[PDB]
Amino acid sequence: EVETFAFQAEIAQLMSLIINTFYSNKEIFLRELISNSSDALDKIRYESLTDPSKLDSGKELHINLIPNKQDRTLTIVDTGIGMTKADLINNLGTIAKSGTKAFMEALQAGADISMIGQFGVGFYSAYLVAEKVTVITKHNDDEQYAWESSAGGSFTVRTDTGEPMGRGTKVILHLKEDQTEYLEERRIKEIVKKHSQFIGYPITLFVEK
Numbered sequence: 001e002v003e004t005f006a007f008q009a010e011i012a013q014l015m016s017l018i019i020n021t022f023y024s025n026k027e028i029f030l031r032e033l034i035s036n037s038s039d040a041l042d043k044i045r046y047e048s049l050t051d052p053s054k055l056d057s058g059k060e061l062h063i064n065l066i067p068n069k070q071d072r073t074l075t076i077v078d079t080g081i082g083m084t085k086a087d088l089i090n091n092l093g094t095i096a097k098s099g100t101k102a103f104m105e106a107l108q109a110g111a112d113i114s115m116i117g118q119f120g121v122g123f124y125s126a127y128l129v130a131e132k133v134t135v136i137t138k139h140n141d142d143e144q145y146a147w148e149s150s151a152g153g154s155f156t157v158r159t160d161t162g163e164p165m166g167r168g169t170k171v172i173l174h175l176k177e178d179q180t181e182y183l184e185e186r187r188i189k190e191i192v193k194k195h196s197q198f199i200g201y202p203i204t205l206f207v208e209k
């Protein structure tokens, strides 16, 4: 049962801008995704302080970076708070609409794509290097979902019957043919050290094979 939705015009426009604008500093996508994971981890930790049972789905708070050359994917995994179906289909888009407007106005004023995170829409920077993005997420008290989009103005959502993850989010980046450098251990280590060296959670970079 796969449902297809249309991105709001503003988000579709943002994605097209990210995909079409000539901008060489693409590596910043990783920092934005790790930052999103860190925020999600901060939230579940905060909520667990008043309701310890929210960690029954997993006490470990961390981030895993998993590259796979055979599938040509780079997956950013976290055990943060996770997203509900409502987040994926309506709420995150509602919030992203205003962030997108501010970002594009900032761009015409002289800002550049690397500052996308200051507008709450850094997630979409994933399209700087991925032709398709698959997001698997599980929030307590909601089912595990699989969100997916190759841009083009639409995305899909389905209940994920794959391997249960407990709680958290996995952003699976199906890399563009000319962006496989982000599957190399050397490259990922360099980027994490450069832009995400102070994240307050363990970041484990898995090795290939």
Ligand SMILES: CC(C)NCCCn1c(Cc2cc3c(cc2I)OCO3)nc2c(N)nc(F)nc21
Pocket (backbone or CB within 6 Å): 036, 037, 039, 040, 043, 078, 080, 081, 082, 083, 088, 092, 096, 120, 121, 123, 135, 147, 168, 169
């Ligand atoms: C309340 C706050 C935590 N929401 C953050 C924005 C959504 N967000 C995002 C950013 C985001 C993710 C999307 C998305 C829109 C956005 I913005 O479309 C489907 O996947 N990343 C995560 C993440 N790793 N974990 C959790 F819990 N939330 C994610």
